[PDB]
């Protein structure tokens, strides 16, 4: 699942082929 330890969603985000975030930079 998404890898990107720098996005903070929960249970729902569809973060699994569509991450859009960098390490200190997530904007969900
Ligand atoms: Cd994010
Ligand atoms: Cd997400
Ligand atoms: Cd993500």
Redesign the pocket.
């Given at each position: 699942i998404?890898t990107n330890a720098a996005?903070k969603?929960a249970n729902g985000?569809?973060?699994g082929s569509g991450?859009s975030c960098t390490e200190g930079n997530c904007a969900?």
């Open positions: 998404c996005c969603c985000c569809k973060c991450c969900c």
